[PDB]
Each structure stands twice: as structure tokens, then as C-alpha cells.
Design a protein around this ligand. Structure first.
Ligand SMILES: Cc1cc2nc3c(=O)[nH]c(=O)nc-3n(C[C@H](O)[C@H](O)[C@H](O)COP(=O)(O)OP(=O)(O)OC[C@H]3O[C@@H](n4cnc5c(N)ncnc54)[C@H](O)[C@@H]3O)c2cc1C
Ligand SMILES: Cc1cc2nc3c(=O)[nH]c(=O)nc-3n(C[C@H](O)[C@H](O)[C@H](O)COP(=O)(O)OP(=O)(O)OC[C@H]3O[C@@H](n4cnc5c(N)ncnc54)[C@H](O)[C@@H]3O)c2cc1C
Ligand SMILES: Nc1ncnc2c1ncn2[C@@H]1O[C@H](COP(=O)(O)OP(=O)(O)OP(=O)(O)O)[C@@H](O)[C@H]1O
Ligand SMILES: Nc1ncnc2c1ncn2[C@@H]1O[C@H](COP(=O)(O)OP(=O)(O)OP(=O)(O)O)[C@@H](O)[C@H]1O
Ligand SMILES: [Mg+2]
Ligand SMILES: [Mg+2]
Lengths: 657, 661
């Protein structure tokens, strides 16, 4: 058997050659990627089981379809999926369901996408025990379809200025929902337009004229039998989008729509029947769990671009040798491999974040602040660097990347949306910047010892100079220490600019605005430091020497590519020299060439079947050209030879001349 | 009147407020953008004329349509367009045709997009006088539909290894075109799949077994009356794409398809009837003229993002004042305004490039191809930097609209998909940057060997001597020259540094081409800096040509924002050798944030100065009048998925699924 477990007989030999050079077992790397040998094996067992159920396969290639056709296809697969789920899956294994959906439903959306991502989690986090019994069970059994309705046409970021109102009628004992203007329409909740018949709905709660602020409510939207909008409801789709068009993102409006008092979600907060209010002592779920989604989507795109790079030949290096694999050019390795490093790094960073999400929550029955800040920065950097890498992966396929035969353009449209959902990236970076400024005030005021673990480096003292290419035994610790220095220096520098403008008389919020770009520079460096450290932490946890060396090579590529990308900050104070920067450059180009024989195996280790990956250029077997010709020939515009546009128009136009 | 000529009564006052602060006449800035007052006025006159012809309007909003519906809509407008063109336009000055097409046909494509972009230019540049009479006239009159077929399924970059063959039969006096394998299929030529009935076709020419390399041929593809494929022709669409889906990009295959000898394009090469060859003494057209296309598409996206930023309120700065325009936050100004600077810079750089394209070509009747090399290298780098930085900016503009930007009501996502395609067409960006790098390495060998005086004007700075230190924030001068000199220093230093690494590996024994590959990433760093320097210098040159003081000050503010944003983005190269200090870099930072706030009251006018009507711009968020929310609610309500209340997906599937539980 081969160390690379994806080789099959008959595969394109140009691609097999790249798998044959693997130094590690791809099953063992999968276990690392997916958090356990068991987890990885279940992925493969699910994939092998779905191969025997053709009902759950793409009835035709998805890029052939109109929006209407895709929505029908998705619901077709979903009904079959919900019926047969237990034959394939442990429904309670949130991990198995995610993979099952990726193979069967894919990334473009489905009618119950929000049902899982937010509707159920909102019920877990905010409904009382009695209410969970009424609604959460019906949701889990898929008796109803639900979503989470927070954003409105005129507000998504702010929320203290939402316009939908829930006014408590003390007699009758109902909440009266009302949408006073068009801008108060709920707007963007996924699966709200056509699919959901219930929603959790954020609205400003009014009692005795007093505004208690945003609160969440269970709201029936459509009749459970005919699916018509209940009286007082205005509801529909918000139209087509950049991507993710299978989800029916919706608008929702209320004309004095009454719900029971008990529709207010009361695990935290109560409104008694007379009107009395009792105060208690997320959205954070989405940010914590979306990081794998981005890593995975980045890995989709790199699997395709790197596989295609092994089969695509183009140009000569040596004039007496044949055309080389484009994978041969340093320019091509340089535009792919740093992103393979990033995809592993994002995965490992996401595992630590999910652990921290579970660690708070557990402790919540003084660390939510640290989690909110980490997640704020990480969601913004990961999403932005993923987009950069996906698009580099598309363009690395040449002309054909622009075709939907690559599928990378759809991977891009869906992944990039995470720059805006779950918190605008600019806003989430400034959210982290507030935490970093608080931390900088601790340092400046002598309370350095009160810094939490994630931000203690801001209190540490820097050595004069950075010991890259100095201390014997080139270690990743001198790179970590260099990242720490530049992130601390920019954090304290940006903070002090802010403090200095207030000291000089400017209002807090105007000084904040004037320093906000600088402050986002700090957030970004602090977060990019976190990704490095998480990557290095995993490399050191591993005992299997072949796996450890493979990921260690990747880590070395990571720290040199990233440090070079931020070299400006290392040079400003002379922390780094010209000579150390040329060392980082030569190291970057060295580790490109080191990684190459493993590049395809490092991506095969994610173990995406063709039915998941949906790419012709990225076919597991490497037989691109023949299947690309078929895919073109079978596409909808080639049904007829001479188009209606040519008969109706165009031919008459030519005749007239 | 108002200095800003786009204000109309009834407009959203949040947006009007931003136009009222203009310091210059937007008609006068249009003249600067489009190269003359007359040209700019014609744009507006064309727009006013098209308002009286509703037949040429989007029959319904384009994002509502399937691919099939859009293609039908495009040909509908095209037929009307070709019949009524003379009523609106001077067909020969075009130019006006480019703008007419932008309003009527838009960016997503049309059946005759490549008819203009490449088919006709190929006939101008490569057909003899006799052949132009046969084919170019029919093309201009739109008697035929044509395209340019170079790329194949297996080769786009490496033309030397194309697989389609044209073998000369000496008897019969024909060329025999043949497609020996699937990978030899022509693949990607726009409008080839369904619309064109003729094409210019690049193929390796064989005579008596000898391969003379790529040559271009006029090739009839479909019957002029039935539009069926002529015998021996395999032809169709290559399928849907990231964007630009109205163009039917095609595949084309030949089974020993014979064309006359005289179908070889013979303005420069000849093949006589017996077989005799005779050697002569582009694609460069596309690269030269596509730069405005990118500038314009960048300006579309910024018009939308900045207009929407004036009407979108969100959050408080001062806690006792109402929610602010998002166009107030420094992060928002920082994510838009540098790209406004870039869009002007690309336009001005594109005008100088088109002048150089005309200046060679003009000189190519005499000697005199000793300037094609300078043009090819400039165009190689510029097409790569402009296209890549445009994409960065378009996407920043989309995300500056928040959630709604992701909707097609913004239209920026389509602007993005179409514009970014230019990172790959007309030369892969990585390949075109290395094409420039060859020219820079040749130039570095002149310097190293003492022939500095032989450097052409565009690359003479590589021979100049640098001062010790860069005089930004040191020495007053009337603005910008110390920034230019700093850009020159870092671009020269990286060029000579990357070149010497290449020379050093050969000196140590590596083969030329392996040393090249090993230095290629570094070499593209040089290309990029040299090109980004050119854009600065072109921008500064235009600022100094202008006499109208208000216009000059407005563009001067933009130029200052440009040089500080770009220099900061490349600061690594300025700091490495101590050319710049920490303190000068903090000056560049403070300058960047200053010029953001300086530019703001002009931001919306600088974009209105491009003078894109709503029918051109196609954005709900970007409406000239600023009435976003009401027209966004309508746009959603009228979209195709809201025709019915309960979807078929709910009746067929989904409702049964719920019942079963
Ligand atoms: C929207 C779009 C429209 C198009 N329209 C037309 C048309 O109308 N007519 C026509 O003929 N073609 C058309 N094309 C095709 C286009 O010309 C080619 O796709 C383009 O030239 C890229 O070449 P390629 O496809 O062979 O990419 P490839 O060369 O196959 O792959 C490029 C990758 O390999 C690398 N690479 C390749 N060669 C080298 C080298 N020497 N050195 C270093 N790296 C290298 C690059 O780094 C890049 O990452 C279109 C393409 C697109 C996307
Ligand atoms: C694919 C997609 C899916 C979505 N799914 C859901 C869903 O499922 N459920 C749901 O409830 N909502 C959903 N939304 C809406 C989403 O939550 C909001 O769009 C997102 O949170 C951003 O808020 P916004 O639209 O108001 O951005 P805006 O505030 O309108 O941003 C516009 C510009 O203003 C900037 N800006 C805003 N505030 C500040 C500030 N204080 N300081 C500096 N700059 C600022 C922003 O950085 C941005 O550049 C979705 C949106 C998208 C695109
Ligand atoms: N003109 C371009 N078109 C497409 N992609 C590009 C272009 N220039 C750079 N890239 C990509 O951006 C990534 C960064 O490469 P590189 O660091 O050499 O360029 P840069 O960061 O833009 O310049 P520098 O790092 O020298 O400031 C690479 O993946 C490269 O492929
Ligand atoms: N996390 C992010 N998500 C989306 N866009 C971003 C993000 N960070 C930066 N940008 C965009 O990149 C552009 C450049 O700004 P900036 O220089 O602050 O970012 P950067 O270059 O990545 O950071 P630095 O300059 O410190 O390396 C800005 O216009 C901004 O909109
Ligand atoms: Mg870089
Ligand atoms: Mg920057």
C-alpha cells in the first residue's frame, strides 16, 4: 500500500507521481485535521455509505441549474436526507451531520441551513426548560422549519437602534409585534423568505411605555398546514445574491401581530403576567464554529488548484525537456502553498477556539470577554485571508478557473460572505481593539499582572533584537517572539495615540474614530500571532514523527511567509535587520520546495470526495480534459445548435446589411 | 447652479449634503477623466438621447434573469442598437460606441463583444489591403459576427506549443486546419460557441513538413444563411462561468477543414501559391485599451459604495448625537478613498499607455520597432497591477455596503466577477509580470556593464544615483517629488537586487532557466514596484498639466492620498536599507489619515464626475438620487422568487417532510 491513501489504479500518472512522494500516511493526517482517528474514519465511512445511495447525489451538475432548479434539488435531497439520516449517521453527533450535509447538500445553501446554525442554538441558549419542551423537540424532529431574525433593512451592526417593537398588552397577556416603517423590516435572516414557518425574532420590548431593549421571541410565521402567511405577516425573499442562492434570505414585517406572553424566551429574563420585569446576571456560537467552515472551503479551493497544477503542463524550463507541470514554477508554488499552511493553521486555531467556547458556557453555570475578543479578531482575519487564498487558487488554474468547471468561484462567493455576516469585519476588528486598549491601559497603569493569558505578552519585556538566524538551533520560538514584539509594539503604539488625543482634549469617541485604522492594525497582528501559536502548539503535541515533520515544514513556511508580509513592523524599530529579512526570504523559497512533494498529500488528507468537492478540474483521479469536454458538451446552452437569440434577433440583423 | 452638476431637487438630503461640499465643477472633472470637454459632453448627450428610447432599456432588472433570458435580452438590444446607432452616435468615433454599449449592453457581455475588442483589431493589424476590403468592411457593417480564436483547451500561455495545425496543400492551394486531440480544441474565445459565424484563428502553419509557428487565418464557421456549422466544424459553448455569462465563450474543432490560401492574413507574412514563405521585418491592443475598462469598473463599484455610505446611517460616535453616516468612520473612508485615487490613477495611466500604443504603430510604418519592446513591458506590468488592485478595491467597495452589498441589488459582485477576469485573460498576471521582469533584467545588465546611458526613458531611473536618505518631511518643494524619488529608489534597488540574484546563480553554475525559476518571485517583486512607480508618475504628470486651479487642487489632494497609501503599503522596501526612518513612516501614516479627511467633502463629487447614469450603473444601492430603502423593498418584492407565496419546493417536498413527524 502507498503512504498516500487516495491513489487508485488508473489515475492520471502526472498526479499519482505527486502522491507517490508523500512522507506520511494521509489517514493519520486526516485524524490530525479532524480531531481524532475515529472522527476521520467516520467521515470516510459516511462517504462510502453515500456512494450506495444515488438518490442523495446531485441529480445534475449544480452549475447547470437556475436558482429555482437548485432550490427544488436541495429540498429533494433534504427530504430523503431527513428520512434516511439514521442509516448513515448518529444524528446526535454534530460532527457527522456537518460532513453529511457537505456531501449531500453542499455549500450553496438549503432550506434548513439556518434551522441548525442559529434557530436551534438560540433555543438552547435562551429558551426555558418548559419552552424547550414545546419548541426545541419539534425543531430537532424537523416538524417545523425555523430561523433567527435579528437584522433589519436599516440596522444590522447596531441593534440598540432596531426599530421592530414588541409592546406588552397587560390585559390579554400578549406581546404586540409591529413594524413601524420599511426600514424596520427584518431583512437577511436565512430561510426566512419562503421556507421557515417559525422564527426567533429580536425586537425592542416595550412595557408601560418603557423600552427594555432587544429581546428574542418565538413567532409563528406561516400556517402549519397551508403554509400561507398568518394574518398580519408580510414575508418574502430578498432576491438573488452574489452567491449562496439556495438559501431564501427573507424580509419580514408585522402589522400589530399578537403572540402569547410565553413566546418571550425566558431562560434569562422574565416578564410576569402583570408586567413585572426581572433582569438576568450570541452570535458567539456562529463565530466560533464558522472558522472550520472557512478552513474547509479554503481547502476545497486548494485541493482543486493544486491537483490541477499537477496535471496542467505549460511552458518549458529546460529547453531540451518537455513542457513542465505548472506546479514546477516557484511562482505557482508560492501562490498556493502558503495558503495550504493557512488552511491547517485556521483549522487548528478553530479547534482551540471551540474548546474555549465549551470551556466558557460550562463555566457559565469572567472569560466571556476573552472569548468574545479572540473570536472577533479571528473571524475577521480568517475570513479575509481565506478570500485572498481562494482567489489565488482560482487564478492558478488559468482560464479554466473562471469556468464553473473549477467551482472555485462559487466557493469564493460563499466563503467571502463571512467577511460581513456574524459581524462586519471592520467592526469586529474594532471590537477586539477595545479589549486590546483595555489591556494596554492595564500595562500603562502598572496592572500588568492582571492581564489574562491570551494578552499577557503585552506586559512582557522584549529583548533588544529578535534572534532569527542567531541562536543556534533555528527554532520557531524566535519567530513567535518576533510576532509577539511587533503585535505588542503596535498595540501599545496605537493605544497611546488614542490616549494622547484624549489627554490633548479630544472627546473619547472622536479620538477613537481618528485612531481606528491604526487600532485595527493592532487587532490584526494580535490575531495573526494567535494563529501562529496555535499552529506551533499542535506541532508540538504530535508524537508520530512523520506527521510532526510534515506539519513542521508547513509551520516553517507559515512563519516565514507571514513574517515577510508584516516585515514593515519588524524593521521600523530596528528589531529586525536587512540580513534577517533576507534569511526569511531564502527560508520562504526553501520551504516552498521542501513542501512540494507533500503538497498534494497534505490536501488529500482532508479527504473530500468528488461528490463533496463538485469540481471537474479537481477530480480525485486527475482525468481533467476528457471530463471537461463532456461537462461543456452537456451544459444547458448546447442543447440546441442555433440559439433562439440567433433566430429571433441577430440573423435578421445580419441579413439587413 | 451648484458646482456638483448631479444634484436634483427631491434627492435624498443625506446624499445632497455630500455633493453640496464640492470645490470643483463636475463637468470640468469629467472633461479631465474622459480626455476633453467635447467627449465628456457627448457622453451626457448620448445619455439624454437614450432616455427618449425605452426600447434600449433593460426590459427588466438583469439579476432577475436566467442566462438564457439575459442572452435574449442582449441580442434584442443589440439589433435595435445597430439599426438606430447613427441617430445617437458617430459610428466611426468610438469612443462614443464604447459609452453607448456601456449604457445599453452593460458589462455582463453581448453577442458581439469580441467582434469589437479583437476580431476587427486583428483584421486592422494583420490583414492585407485586399483582405480588409473583403472582410473588414463586412465586419464594420455587421454583416458577419466574428471573434479571435487563440487559446486552446491545453494551451493559453505557451503559444509555441499550440496543437491546432494549418497544413498547406500545394495542389488545391488550400490550408488544411485540423484538431488532432481534444486538448487542441480552441477554447475560451468569446462569442465563439453560438454567435460568431467567422473567426480569426491562431494555428501552427505547416508547409512541406516544416513548422513555421503560430499564424492567423480567416475561417468561416457557420453557414451565413442557416447558421449551421459548416462541414468539418465542431463548435459549442464552454458552459456557465464565474461571471460575464452573456458572452458565449466557445470551443472549436476541425476535421481536416480546408480554407483558401488567401485566408492566411498577409499584411506582414506571405505564402505564395507554390509554397514559398517570406518572413516579416497583439494582444498588445487589448492590454493597452483594457486599462480604462478596469478604472471604469472600479469607479462603478466606488460610486455605489460611496453613495450608499452617505445614505447608510449606523452607530453613534458622540453618544448624545444621532446615528452617523457610515461615511464618517475613518475605517470606511480608509477602505474607499484610496481606491478612488487608484481609479483616477489607472485612467490617467491608461491614457498615456494608449498614447504610446499610437506612437508606436505610428512609428511602425517607418523603421522602427525599437519601442515595441518598451510598450510590451509597460503594458505587461500595468495590465497585471491594475487588474489585481482593481479587484482588491471592488471587493472593499462591496463589503463597505454591509449585508446589502452581498445582494445583487448592489450589483458590485457582478462588477467584481467581470473585472477580475482580466487577471487571467490577455496574459496570466504572473506570466505578464515575468515578461516585464525580462525587460528589467536586460536593463539591469546595461547598468551593471556601464551602458546606463543606453537606457530608454521609461527605465532610466535604474541608472540614476540615489541620495543617501529620502527627503520626505525634510525639504519643502511644491509637493510629491520626494515621494516619486522614494518610489524610484525602492524600485531600482529591488530590480538590481533581484537581477543580481539571478546573475549570481548562473555565475555559480546553474542553468539560465533554472536560475530564472528560482528567482521568479523576487523578480515579480521588481516588476510590481516598477509598475506602481509608473502609475504615480502618470498621476503626477496629469496634475501638473492642469491649469484650472480648483480641478488641480482636487486631483492634487487625491494624488497626496495616493502616494501616502501606496508608499505605506510598500514601506518594507523603504525601511530595509534605512532609506526611510520610523519617523518619516509615521509622517506617511499621519498624512494618509489627514488626506482621508481632506478628500471626504469631495468624495461623492469625484465619483459623480465619471457621470454614470442609473441605466449604466444598474445598482439599487447606488441610485443617483439616494432613495435606497424604498427602491430596495420594491426590488426584493418584484424579484422572481416572490411570484408565488408558497414555493413548489414547499408543496412537493418539505411540507410532506414536516407532516411525517
Ligand atoms: C473571462 C476570460 C475570457 C477569455 N477570452 C478569450 C478570448 O476571447 N480568446 C482567446 O484566445 N482566449 C481567451 N481566454 C483565455 C486566456 O487568454 C487564457 O486563459 C490566459 O491567457 C491564461 O493562459 P492559460 O489559460 O493557459 O493559464 P495556464 O498557463 O494554463 O495556468 C496559469 C498558471 O500557471 C502559471 N504559469 C503558466 N505559465 C507560466 C510560466 N512560463 N512561468 C511561470 N508561471 C507560469 C501561472 O503562474 C498561473 O498560475 C479568456 C480567459 C478568461 C478567464
Ligand atoms: C450571506 C449573508 C447572510 C446573512 N445571514 C443572516 C442571518 O442568518 N440572520 C441574521 O439575523 N442576519 C443575517 N445577515 C445580516 C448580517 O448580520 C449583517 O449584514 C452583518 O451583521 C453586517 O451588519 P450590517 O449589514 O448592518 O453592516 P453595516 O453597518 O451597514 O456596514 C456598512 C459599512 O459601515 C461600517 N461600519 C458599520 N458600523 C461601523 C462602526 N461602529 N465603526 C466603523 N465602521 C462601521 C462597516 O464596517 C461597513 O463597512 C446576513 C448577511 C449576509 C451578507
Ligand atoms: N498582479 C497580481 N495578480 C494576481 N495575484 C497577485 C498579483 N501580485 C501578487 N499576487 C498574489 O499575492 C500574493 C502575495 O505575493 P507577493 O508577496 O510576492 O506580492 P505582494 O504582497 O503584492 O507584494 P510585496 O509582498 O512585495 O509587497 C501571491 O499569492 C501572489 O500570487
Ligand atoms: N480583516 C479584514 N477584512 C476585510 N478587509 C480588510 C481586513 N483588514 C484589512 N482590510 C482591507 O485592506 C485594506 C488595507 O488596509 P490595511 O493596510 O489596514 O490592511 P493590511 O494591509 O492587511 O494591514 P497592514 O497594512 O497593517 O499589513 C483596507 O482598505 C481594508 O479595507
Ligand atoms: Mg507579501
Ligand atoms: Mg497596508
Amino acid at each position: 500500500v502507498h503512504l498516500n491513501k487516495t491513489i487508485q489504479e488508473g489515475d492520471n500518472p502526472d498526479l499519482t507521481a505527486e502522491r507517490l512522494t508523500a512522507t506520511f500516511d494521509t489517514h493519520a493526517m486526516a485524524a490530525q485535521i479532524y480531531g481524532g482517528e475515529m472522527r476521520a474514519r467516520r467521515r470516510r465511512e459516511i462517504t462510502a455509505k453515500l456512494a450506495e445511495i444515488p438518490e442523495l447525489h446531485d441529480s445534475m451538475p449544480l452549475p447547470y441549474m437556475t436558482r429555482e432548479e437548485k432550490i427544488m434539488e436541495s429540498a429533494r435531497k433534504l427530504t430523503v436526507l431527513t428520512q434516511r439520516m439514521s442509516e448513515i449517521i448518529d444524528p446526535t453527533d454534530a460532527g457527522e451531520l456537518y460532513h453529511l450535509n457537505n456531501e449531500v447538500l453542499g455549500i450553496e445553501g438549503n432550506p434548513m441551513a439556518l434551522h441548525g446554525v442559529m434557530f436551534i442554538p438560540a433555543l438552547n441558549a435562551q429558551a426555558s426548560d418548559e419552552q424547550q419542551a414545546k419548541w426545541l423537540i419539534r425543531a430537532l424532529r424537523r416538524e417545523i422549519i425555523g430561523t433567527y431574525a435579528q437584522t433589519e433593512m436599516g440596522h444590522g451592526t447596531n441593534l440598540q437602534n432596531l426599530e421592530t417593537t414588541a409592546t406588552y398588552d397587560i390585559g390579554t397577556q400578549e406581546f404586540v409585534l409591529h413594524t413601524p416603517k420599511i426600514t424596520a423590516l427584518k431583512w437577511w435572516p436565512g430561510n426566512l423568505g419562503k421556507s421557515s414557518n417559525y422564527a426567533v425574532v429580536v425586537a425592542h420590548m416595550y412595557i408601560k411605555g418603557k423600552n427594555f431593549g432587544p429581546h428574542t421571541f418565538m413567532v409563528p410565521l406561516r400556517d402549519e398546514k397551508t403554509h400561507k402567511p398568518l394574518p398580519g405577516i408580510t414575508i418574502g425573499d430578498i432576491g438573488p445574491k452574489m452567491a449562496y442562492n439556495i438559501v431564501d434570505n427573507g424580509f419580514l414585517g408585522f402589522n400589530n401581530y399578537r403572540i402569547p406572553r410565553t413566546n418571550l424566551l425566558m431562560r434569562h429574563t422574565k416578564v410576569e403576567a402583570d408586567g413585572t420585569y426581572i433582569k438576568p446576571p450570541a452570535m458567539v456560537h456562529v463565530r466560533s464554529y464558522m472558522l472550520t467552515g472557512q478552513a474547509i472551503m479554503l481547502s476545497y479551493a486548494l485541493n482543486i488548484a493544486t491537483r490541477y497544477s499537477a496535471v496542467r503542463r505549460q511552458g518549458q524550463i529546460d529547453k531540451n525537456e518537455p513542457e513542465v507541470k505548472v506546479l514546477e514554477y516557484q511562482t505557482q508554488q508560492h501562490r498556493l502553498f502558503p495558503f495550504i499552511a493557512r488552511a491547517y493553521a485556521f483549522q487548528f486555531a478553530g479547534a482551540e477556539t471551540v474548546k474555549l467556547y465549551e470551556r466558557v458556557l460550562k463555566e457559565m453555570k469572567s472569560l466571556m470577554a476573552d472569548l468574545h475578543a479572540l473570536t472577533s479578531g479571528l473571524k475577521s482575519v480568517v475570513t479575509h485571508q481565506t478570500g485572498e487564498g481562494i482567489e489565488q487558487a482560482r487564478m492558478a488554474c488559468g482560464g479554466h478557473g473562471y469556468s464553473m468547471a473549477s467551482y472555485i468561484s462559487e466557493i469564493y462567493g460563499v466563503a467571502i460572505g463571512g467577511c460581513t455576516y456574524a459581524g462586519e469585519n471592520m467592526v469586529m476588528l474594532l471590537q477586539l481593539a477595545r479589549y486590546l486598549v483595555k489591556s494596554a491601559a492595564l500595562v500603562k497603569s502598572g496592572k500588568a499582572s492582571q492581564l489574562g493569558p491570551l494578552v499577557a505578552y503585552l506586559g512582557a519585556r522584549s529583548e533588544p533584537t529578535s534572534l532569527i538566524d542567531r541562536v543556534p538551533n533555528g527554532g520557531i520560538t524566535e519567530y513567535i517572539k518576533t510576532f509577539q514584539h511587533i503585535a505588542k509594539r503596535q498595540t501599545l503604539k496605537a493605544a497611546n495615540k488614542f490616549f494622547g488625543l484624549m489627554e490633548n482634549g479630544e472627546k473619547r469617541e472622536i479620538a477613537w474614530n481618528k485612531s481606528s485604522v491604526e487600532l485595527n492594525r493592532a487587532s490584526r497582528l494580535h490575531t495573526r500571532l494567535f494563529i501562529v501559536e496555535a499552529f506551533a502548539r499542535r506541532v508540538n503535541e504530535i508524537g508520530d514523527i512523520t506527521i510532526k515533520e510534515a506539519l513542521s515544514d508547513l509551520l516553517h513556511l507559515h512563519v516565514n511567509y507571514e513574517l515577510l508580509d508584516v516585515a514593515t513592523y519588524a524593521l521600523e524599530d530596528g528589531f529586525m535587520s536587512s540580513t534577517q529579512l533576507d534569511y526569511v526570504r531564502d527560508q520562504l523559497y526553501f520551504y516552498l520546495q521542501k513542501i512540494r512533494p507533500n503538497a498534494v498529500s497534505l490536501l488529500d488528507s482532508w479527504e473530500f470526495s468528488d461528490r463533496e468537492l463538485r469540481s471537474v478540474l479537481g477530480r480525485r483521479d486527475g482525468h481533467v480534459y476528457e471530463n471537461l469536454f463532456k461537462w461543456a458538451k452537456e451544459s444547458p446552452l448546447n442543447k440546441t445548435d442555433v440559439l433562439p437569440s440567433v433566430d429571433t434577433y441577430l440573423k435578421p440583423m445580419m441579413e439587413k446589411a
